[PDB]
Amino acid sequence: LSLTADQMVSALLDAEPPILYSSEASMMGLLTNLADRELVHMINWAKRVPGFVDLTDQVHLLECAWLEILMIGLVWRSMEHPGKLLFAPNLLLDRNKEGMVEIFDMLLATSSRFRMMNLQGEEFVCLKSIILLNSGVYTFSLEEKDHIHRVLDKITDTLIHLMAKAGLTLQQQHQRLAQLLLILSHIRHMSNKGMEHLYLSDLLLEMLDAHR
Amino acid sequence: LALSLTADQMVSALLDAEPPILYSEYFSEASMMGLLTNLADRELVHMINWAKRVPGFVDLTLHDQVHLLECAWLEILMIGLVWRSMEHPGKLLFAPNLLLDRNQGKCVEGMVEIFDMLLATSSRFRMMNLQGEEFVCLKSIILLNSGVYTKDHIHRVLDKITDTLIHLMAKAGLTLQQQHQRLAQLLLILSHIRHMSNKGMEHLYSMKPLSDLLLEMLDAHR
Amino acid sequence: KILHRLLQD
Amino acid sequence: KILHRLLQ
């Protein structure tokens, strides 16, 4: 809340979770098992997101954005692997599939979008933090809501910091900011669609039951 | 064409293309949906005509125009509902003669959770003091963005609308920092509008006396 | 789809 | 609810 934007990035980068390793029924077992272990790291990552521990609310924000955060992480990992999705270093899958064949394409499309935009890691950690604080902010009390917006504004400044320190003109900064945040709308879409098909440890169902 | 207009010319075109506020006929589970589906059906006809008046939309393939409308129609309906419900806090103004509250949502099962998110978005637009010139920009963005990853021309038109949004904020006294923060705040709400649409789409398919057009729209999300 | 017709007229 | 304990 009182961190320089350089210190903002450094905090988020340092708080990054590791990249974990891992027919039709077997592959879902792999993804389910992988996501379940990722959720454990995400929760402790969320605690290291500036302002998150200043809330109660934490359960609700995670319950709404967990699949989003998982998906943007996946998309980020698959950025330098065109046509494929890198779920894990030992699990790189392309289009070659029941029903999530559409989700794959949306993830590939999102990953392709990150590629041409040349998304930076410093920008990625900012977006992922935004998803955490934003996705469940209008489902709440309002005393914390005011503070969340202040943190969101701080991350916005941090994003603009990075672009300005990249040589981009003032207009290019606004445009790239818009382009980035508009992608979060698609991630919400993929999450909701993905959440639909999901309807398997106790934690993964506690998150899954929240979107019933 | 859309690329070659001033930010002021962009706004004036959007404001002039605005669909009118329709009325409903002059509750329960069947009657409530009946009025809503009837209203939405008539709104969609105007929306399609509004879409063609949005700069750079006609410049797209007919197939692409169909795709964007089918993906964003409920979002556009909702953000319009949210906008005209600003001056009526705690209530949703579907029509000037159709004002509903939270308790009135309890007639259609599963519809009250959407109503709460809609009110929250409305109170957000209120808190932000969203301007009409900004509202028409957000609506145009929803149209061009929501179905773009399901392109090179569209992203340039979106950039043009982004330029237009900043133009409005710069011409209101807001500093550069306040411009970035407000822009970001507005676009993040679009993520929630997407969420409400997805949840709303879900309950519509759960109920599916919808019209042919309204059923064609819903089957696209099937 | 009738949507094609509305978009053309 | 599981998420409560782990967060604490």
Ligand SMILES: CC[C@@H](c1ccc(O)cc1)[C@H](c1ccccc1)c1ccc(O)cc1
């Ligand atoms: C896109 C693959 C995910 C998925 C999510 C929902 C589905 O209906 C199908 C697949 C998958 C997943 C997530 C949660 C539960 C099951 C599968 C996942 C996502 C990100 C990640 O880092 C690891 C796995």
Ligand SMILES: CC[C@@H](c1ccc(O)cc1)[C@H](c1ccccc1)c1ccc(O)cc1
């Ligand atoms: C939120 C109200 C809409 C709705 C959408 C989905 C539902 O499951 C319940 C209600 C609705 C709607 C849309 C399509 C079909 C029925 C109801 C609508 C929204 C805006 C508007 O200006 C007019 C109607």
